[PDB]
Amino acid sequence: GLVPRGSHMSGATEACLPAGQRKSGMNINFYQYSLKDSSTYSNAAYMAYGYASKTKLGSVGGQTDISIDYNIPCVSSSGTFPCPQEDSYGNWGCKGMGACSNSQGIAYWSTDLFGFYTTPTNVTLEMTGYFLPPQTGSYTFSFATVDDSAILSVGGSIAFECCAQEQPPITSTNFTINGIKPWDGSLPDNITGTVYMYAGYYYPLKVVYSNAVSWGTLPISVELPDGTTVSDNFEGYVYSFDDDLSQSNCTIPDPSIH
Ligand SMILES: OC[C@H]1O[C@H](O[C@@H]2[C@@H](O[C@H]3[C@@H](O)[C@H](O)[C@@H](CO)O[C@H]3O)O[C@H](CO)[C@@H](O)[C@@H]2O)[C@@H](O)[C@@H](O)[C@@H]1O
Ligand SMILES: [Ca+2]
Ligand SMILES: [Ca+2]
Ligand SMILES: [Cl-]
Ligand code: NA
Ligand code: NA
């Protein structure tokens, strides 16, 4: 036929063509989360949008390295140094440092998350921006692990609305990756998710991440159509645009027929 038929039952993921000045990287907003609260982050409504009803702590823009790898301090005989969780032992020490005098159960202040001074032990953050596929095909996003709770959403009307990156969060719970901490503890059922994307369109991307205590971990990757994997550093793939709610043609409901 002269034209492609389109994805079945309007199945294509909504994308965007923002006309304004493109900025490299994602915006990261930080919100209050209570130390050792092991329940709030288990609710889908909280992880999709309820986080923004808590106090906003601040923000950083232009972030291309988006994985989280926060290690608490070990106050050791030779000074205070971050302890990789796999090197923690006993009650407690850190391999190569001896016994640690400090508690694993208190808040710690650091700039480890995106250079922003906060409590990485206990915080929720929202990463927003647009993913620009260089290749048409299936993209598989993944979290290698999650400590404590996280979601990833892709698409207009799923992550956020086209040309409206800076607005309060939308209520969609149709997550691309549901990494929400189960009520029974243990691992979420599935921490990949796949999206079919068309080259050159901008796909809204949202990651919401929470830590309640001590270590924080969220190693983010994407497998491209060509089979290669991009991990941690998404430079060249993620961008931000200032809101333009007046750009009438911004939303592309079905990129295969655009
Ligand atoms: O999944 C929850 C967190 O687990 C780890 O945090 C540690 C965890 O400690 C456990 C025992 O070792 C402690 O003696 C006991 C005392 O509170 O708690 C158990 O759950 O939980 C503590 C908080 O209660 C933390 O202080 C410990 O660091 C770690 O993987 C965290 O990143 C997880 O969020
Ligand atoms: Ca919409
Ligand atoms: Ca934790
Ligand atoms: Cl040691
Ligand atoms: Na770590
Ligand atoms: Na430290």
Side-chain angles (χ1 to χ4, degrees), residues 108-152:
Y108 291 96
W109 280 257
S110 166
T111 57
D112 178 73
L113 303 177
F114 304 99
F116 180 72
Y117 186 67
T118 190
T119 53
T121 47
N122 58 293
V123 68
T124 294
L125 61 87
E126 176 207 70
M127 318 188 192
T128 56
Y130 296 81
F131 186 92
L132 183 57
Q135 295 178 335
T136 295
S138 188
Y139 288 73
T140 303
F141 292 85
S142 62
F143 298 150
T145 191
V146 180
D147 179 343
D148 285 285
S149 197
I151 60 85
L152 183 149

Coordinates of all heavy atoms in Angstrom, one line a residue, residues 108-152:
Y108 N 22.5 10.5 56.2 CA 23.8 11.1 55.8 C 23.6 12.1 54.7 O 22.8 11.9 53.8 CB 24.8 10.0 55.3 CG 25.3 9.1 56.4 CD1 24.7 7.9 56.7 CD2 26.2 9.5 57.3 CE1 25.1 7.1 57.7 CE2 26.6 8.8 58.4 CZ 26.0 7.5 58.6 OH 26.4 6.8 59.7
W109 N 24.4 13.2 54.7 CA 24.3 14.3 53.8 C 25.5 14.2 52.8 O 26.7 14.0 53.2 CB 24.4 15.6 54.5 CG 23.1 16.0 55.1 CD1 22.2 17.0 54.6 CD2 22.4 15.5 56.3 NE1 21.1 17.1 55.4 CE2 21.2 16.2 56.4 CE3 22.7 14.5 57.2 CZ2 20.3 15.9 57.4 CZ3 21.8 14.3 58.2 CH2 20.6 15.0 58.3
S110 N 25.3 14.4 51.5 CA 26.3 14.2 50.5 C 25.8 14.9 49.2 O 24.6 15.0 49.0 CB 26.4 12.7 50.3 OG 27.1 12.3 49.1
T111 N 26.7 15.2 48.3 CA 26.4 15.6 47.0 C 26.5 14.5 45.9 O 26.4 14.7 44.7 CB 27.4 16.7 46.5 OG1 28.7 16.2 46.6 CG2 27.2 18.0 47.3
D112 N 26.5 13.2 46.4 CA 26.7 12.1 45.5 C 25.6 12.0 44.4 O 25.9 11.5 43.3 CB 26.7 10.8 46.3 CG 26.8 9.6 45.4 OD1 27.9 9.3 44.9 OD2 25.8 8.8 45.2
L113 N 24.4 12.4 44.7 CA 23.3 12.4 43.7 C 23.3 13.7 42.9 O 22.8 14.7 43.3 CB 21.9 12.2 44.4 CG 21.8 11.0 45.3 CD1 20.4 11.0 45.9 CD2 22.1 9.7 44.5
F114 N 24.0 13.6 41.8 CA 23.9 14.7 40.8 C 24.5 16.0 41.2 O 24.2 17.1 40.7 CB 22.5 14.9 40.3 CG 21.8 13.6 39.7 CD1 21.0 12.9 40.5 CD2 22.2 13.2 38.5 CE1 20.4 11.7 40.0 CE2 21.6 12.0 38.0 CZ 20.7 11.3 38.7
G115 N 25.4 15.9 42.2 CA 26.0 17.1 42.8 C 25.1 18.0 43.7 O 25.6 19.0 44.2
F116 N 23.9 17.5 43.9 CA 23.0 18.2 44.8 C 23.1 17.8 46.2 O 23.0 16.6 46.5 CB 21.5 17.9 44.3 CG 20.5 18.6 45.1 CD1 20.3 20.0 45.0 CD2 19.6 17.9 45.9 CE1 19.4 20.6 45.7 CE2 18.7 18.6 46.7 CZ 18.5 19.9 46.5
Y117 N 23.3 18.7 47.1 CA 23.5 18.4 48.5 C 22.2 18.1 49.2 O 21.3 18.9 49.4 CB 24.1 19.6 49.2 CG 24.5 19.4 50.7 CD1 25.5 18.5 51.0 CD2 23.9 20.1 51.7 CE1 26.0 18.3 52.3 CE2 24.3 19.9 53.0 CZ 25.3 19.0 53.3 OH 25.7 18.9 54.6
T118 N 22.0 16.8 49.6 CA 20.8 16.3 50.2 C 21.2 15.1 51.1 O 22.3 14.9 51.4 CB 19.7 16.0 49.1 OG1 18.5 15.8 49.7 CG2 20.1 14.9 48.2
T119 N 20.1 14.3 51.5 CA 20.3 13.1 52.2 C 20.0 11.9 51.3 O 18.9 11.5 51.1 CB 19.3 13.0 53.4 OG1 18.0 13.3 53.0 CG2 19.7 14.1 54.5
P120 N 21.1 11.3 50.6 CA 20.8 10.2 49.7 C 20.3 9.0 50.3 O 19.8 8.1 49.6 CB 22.2 10.0 49.0 CG 22.9 11.3 49.1 CD 22.5 11.8 50.5
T121 N 20.5 8.8 51.6 CA 19.9 7.8 52.4 C 18.4 7.7 52.4 O 17.8 6.7 52.6 CB 20.3 7.9 53.9 OG1 20.2 9.3 54.3 CG2 21.8 7.5 54.1
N122 N 17.8 8.9 52.2 CA 16.3 9.0 52.3 C 15.8 10.2 51.5 O 15.9 11.4 51.9 CB 15.9 9.2 53.8 CG 16.5 10.3 54.6 OD1 17.7 10.4 54.8 ND2 15.6 11.2 55.0
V123 N 15.4 9.9 50.3 CA 15.0 10.9 49.3 C 14.2 10.3 48.2 O 14.4 9.1 48.0 CB 16.3 11.7 48.8 CG1 17.1 10.7 47.9 CG2 15.9 13.0 48.1
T124 N 13.4 11.0 47.5 CA 12.8 10.6 46.2 C 13.3 11.6 45.1 O 13.3 12.8 45.4 CB 11.3 10.5 46.3 OG1 10.9 9.5 47.2 CG2 10.6 10.2 44.9
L125 N 13.6 11.0 44.0 CA 13.9 11.9 42.9 C 13.2 11.5 41.6 O 12.7 10.4 41.4 CB 15.4 12.1 42.7 CG 16.1 10.8 42.4 CD1 16.2 10.5 40.9 CD2 17.6 10.7 42.9
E126 N 12.9 12.6 40.8 CA 12.2 12.5 39.6 C 13.1 13.0 38.5 O 13.5 14.1 38.5 CB 11.0 13.4 39.6 CG 10.2 13.4 38.3 CD 9.4 14.7 38.2 OE1 10.1 15.8 38.0 OE2 8.2 14.7 38.3
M127 N 13.4 12.1 37.5 CA 14.2 12.4 36.4 C 13.3 12.6 35.2 O 12.5 11.7 35.0 CB 15.2 11.3 36.0 CG 16.0 10.7 37.2 SD 17.3 9.6 36.6 CE 17.7 8.8 38.2
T128 N 13.3 13.7 34.5 CA 12.5 13.9 33.3 C 13.4 14.4 32.2 O 14.3 15.2 32.3 CB 11.4 14.9 33.5 OG1 11.9 16.2 34.0 CG2 10.3 14.4 34.5
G129 N 12.9 14.1 31.0 CA 13.5 14.5 29.7 C 12.9 13.8 28.6 O 11.9 13.1 28.7
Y130 N 13.6 13.8 27.4 CA 13.1 13.2 26.2 C 14.2 12.3 25.7 O 15.3 12.7 25.6 CB 12.7 14.2 25.1 CG 11.6 15.2 25.5 CD1 11.8 16.3 26.3 CD2 10.3 15.0 25.0 CE1 10.8 17.2 26.5 CE2 9.3 15.8 25.2 CZ 9.5 17.0 26.0 OH 8.5 17.9 26.2
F131 N 13.8 11.1 25.4 CA 14.7 10.1 24.8 C 14.6 10.2 23.2 O 13.5 10.2 22.7 CB 14.4 8.7 25.2 CG 15.4 7.6 24.8 CD1 16.4 7.3 25.5 CD2 15.2 7.0 23.6 CE1 17.4 6.3 25.1 CE2 16.1 6.0 23.1 CZ 17.2 5.7 23.9
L132 N 15.7 10.4 22.6 CA 15.8 10.6 21.1 C 16.4 9.3 20.5 O 17.6 9.1 20.6 CB 16.7 11.8 20.8 CG 16.8 12.1 19.3 CD1 15.4 12.4 18.6 CD2 17.8 13.3 19.1
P133 N 15.6 8.4 19.9 CA 16.1 7.2 19.3 C 16.9 7.6 18.0 O 16.3 8.3 17.2 CB 14.9 6.4 19.0 CG 13.7 7.3 19.1 CD 14.1 8.5 19.9
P134 N 18.1 7.1 17.8 CA 18.8 7.3 16.6 C 18.4 6.3 15.5 O 18.7 6.5 14.3 CB 20.3 7.0 17.0 CG 20.2 6.1 18.1 CD 19.0 6.5 18.9
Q135 N 17.8 5.2 15.9 CA 17.4 4.0 15.1 C 16.0 3.7 15.3 O 15.6 3.7 16.5 CB 18.2 2.7 15.6 CG 19.7 2.8 15.4 CD 20.5 1.6 15.9 OE1 20.1 0.8 16.7 NE2 21.7 1.3 15.2
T136 N 15.2 3.3 14.3 CA 13.9 2.8 14.5 C 14.0 1.3 14.9 O 14.7 0.6 14.3 CB 13.1 2.9 13.2 OG1 12.9 4.4 13.0 CG2 11.8 2.2 13.3
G137 N 13.2 1.0 16.0 CA 13.1 -0.4 16.4 C 12.8 -0.5 17.9 O 12.4 0.4 18.5
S138 N 13.0 -1.7 18.4 CA 12.7 -2.1 19.8 C 13.9 -1.7 20.7 O 15.0 -2.1 20.4 CB 12.3 -3.6 19.8 OG 11.8 -3.9 21.1
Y139 N 13.5 -0.9 21.7 CA 14.5 -0.5 22.7 C 14.1 -1.2 24.0 O 12.9 -1.2 24.4 CB 14.4 1.0 23.0 CG 15.1 1.8 21.8 CD1 14.4 1.9 20.6 CD2 16.3 2.4 22.0 CE1 15.1 2.6 19.5 CE2 16.9 3.1 20.9 CZ 16.3 3.2 19.7 OH 16.9 3.8 18.7
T140 N 15.0 -1.8 24.7 CA 14.7 -2.5 26.0 C 15.5 -1.8 27.1 O 16.7 -1.8 27.2 CB 15.1 -4.0 26.0 OG1 14.4 -4.6 24.9 CG2 14.7 -4.7 27.3
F141 N 14.7 -1.1 28.0 CA 15.2 -0.4 29.1 C 15.3 -1.4 30.3 O 14.5 -2.3 30.4 CB 14.3 0.8 29.5 CG 14.3 1.9 28.5 CD1 13.4 1.8 27.4 CD2 15.2 3.0 28.6 CE1 13.5 2.8 26.4 CE2 15.2 4.0 27.6 CZ 14.3 3.9 26.6
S142 N 16.3 -1.2 31.1 CA 16.4 -2.1 32.3 C 17.0 -1.4 33.5 O 17.8 -0.4 33.4 CB 17.3 -3.3 32.0 OG 18.6 -2.8 31.6
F143 N 16.6 -1.9 34.6 CA 17.3 -1.7 35.9 C 18.0 -2.9 36.3 O 17.4 -4.0 36.4 CB 16.3 -1.4 37.0 CG 15.4 -0.1 36.8 CD1 14.1 -0.1 37.4 CD2 15.9 1.0 36.2 CE1 13.4 1.0 37.3 CE2 15.1 2.2 36.1 CZ 13.8 2.1 36.7
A144 N 19.3 -2.9 36.5 CA 20.0 -4.1 36.9 C 19.6 -4.6 38.3 O 19.7 -5.8 38.5 CB 21.6 -3.9 36.8
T145 N 19.3 -3.7 39.1 CA 18.8 -4.0 40.5 C 18.1 -2.7 40.9 O 18.2 -1.6 40.3 CB 19.9 -4.4 41.5 OG1 19.2 -4.9 42.7 CG2 20.8 -3.2 41.8
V146 N 17.3 -2.7 42.0 CA 16.6 -1.5 42.6 C 16.8 -1.5 44.1 O 16.4 -2.5 44.8 CB 15.1 -1.6 42.2 CG1 14.4 -0.3 42.8 CG2 14.9 -1.7 40.7
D147 N 17.3 -0.5 44.7 CA 17.4 -0.3 46.1 C 17.1 1.2 46.4 O 18.0 2.0 46.1 CB 18.8 -0.7 46.7 CG 18.9 -0.5 48.2 OD1 18.1 0.2 48.8 OD2 19.9 -1.1 48.8
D148 N 15.9 1.6 46.8 CA 14.8 0.8 47.3 C 13.6 0.6 46.3 O 13.1 -0.6 46.3 CB 14.3 1.3 48.6 CG 15.2 1.0 49.8 OD1 15.2 -0.2 50.2 OD2 15.8 1.9 50.3
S149 N 13.2 1.6 45.6 CA 11.9 1.5 44.8 C 12.1 2.4 43.6 O 12.7 3.5 43.7 CB 10.7 2.0 45.7 OG 9.5 1.7 45.1
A150 N 11.6 2.0 42.4 CA 11.7 2.8 41.2 C 10.8 2.4 40.1 O 10.4 1.3 40.1 CB 13.1 2.7 40.7
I151 N 10.5 3.4 39.3 CA 9.7 3.2 38.1 C 10.4 3.9 36.9 O 11.1 4.9 37.1 CB 8.2 3.6 38.2 CG1 8.0 5.1 38.5 CG2 7.5 2.7 39.2 CD1 8.0 6.0 37.2
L152 N 10.2 3.4 35.7 CA 10.6 4.1 34.5 C 9.3 4.1 33.6 O 8.7 3.1 33.4 CB 11.8 3.4 33.8 CG 12.4 4.1 32.6 CD1 13.9 3.8 32.5 CD2 11.7 3.6 31.4

